[PDB]
A paper describes a structure:
BAZ2B shares 29% sequence identity with TIP5 at the full-length level and harbors similar domain organization. Both proteins contain a MBD (methyl-CpG-binding domain), also known as TAM (TTF-IIP5, ARBP, MeCP1) domain, AT-hook DNA-binding domains, DDT (DNA binding homeobox and different transcription factors), and a PHD (plant homeodomain) zinc finger adjacent to a BRD at their C terminus. Our crystal structures combined with biophysical and mutagenesis data demonstrate that PHD zinc fingers recognize N-terminal unmodified H3K4 tail, whereas the TIP5 and BAZ2B BRDs recognize H4K16ac and H3K14ac, respectively, with specificity pattern KacXXR.
In order to compare the molecular mechanism of the recognition of these sites, we solved high-resolution crystal structures of TIP5 and BAZ2B BRDs with histone H4 peptides bearing acetylation marks at K8, K12, and K16. In contrast to H3K14ac and H4K16ac, the diacetylated peptide H4(6–13)K8acK12ac simultaneously bound two BAZ2B BRD molecules in the complex crystal structure that was solved at 1.6 Å resolution. Interestingly, in this dual-recognition binding mode, the segment H4(6–10) containing the K8ac mark targets one BRD molecule, whereas the H4(10–13) is recognized by a second BRD module. The linking residue L10 may favor the crystallographic packing in its well-accommodated hydrophobic cage formed by F2139 by each BRD. ITC measurements also confirmed a 2:1 stoichiometry of protein to peptide, hence two N-acetyl lysine binding sites for a single histone tail with two acetylation marks. Although this complex is unlikely to be physiological, structural data suggest that BAZ2B BRD recognize only single lysine acetylation marks per binding site.
Numbering used by the authors:
A (entry chain A): 2060 to 2166
B (entry chain C): 7 to 13
Write the structure that this text describes.
């Protein structure tokens, strides 16, 4: 499992994402009952609160598995929403922010 | 109805 430093780094980056102005579509799970089509086409839904619960409960054995789930949030967003939609653009902006933060942390 | 999105 991840040591204390790695857990702290994941938590720090996740908090920076949760507080970003463009995080609003990604803070909680998509409600599959209220958003038709989502369950059908998005096979692995993911959101920041779920990532937080996974991190806290020891479900990420390493940094790479954490980053995969963060990226999954944005990959799902790209599929379900038009690139030019408010959510689509929020997702692209958040991906850019994450990749910069990730690169600045581990370089 | 057909198509994706949250509009």
């Amino acid at each position: 499992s991840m040591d204390s430093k790695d857990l702290a780094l994941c938590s720090m980056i996740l908090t920076e994402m949760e507080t970003h102005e463009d995080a609003w579509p990604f803070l909680l799970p998509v409600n599959l009952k209220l958003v038709p089509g989502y369950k059908k086409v998005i096979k692995k839904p993911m959101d920041f609160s779920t990532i937080r619960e996974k991190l806290s409960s020891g479900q990420y054995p390493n940094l790479e598995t954490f980053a995969l789930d963060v990226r999954l949030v944005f990959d799902n967003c790209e599929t379900f929403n038009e690139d030019d939609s408010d959510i689509g653009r929020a997702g692209h902006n958040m991906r850019k922010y994450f990749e910069k933060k990730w690169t600045d942390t581990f370089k | 109805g057909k198509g994706l999105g949250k509009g």
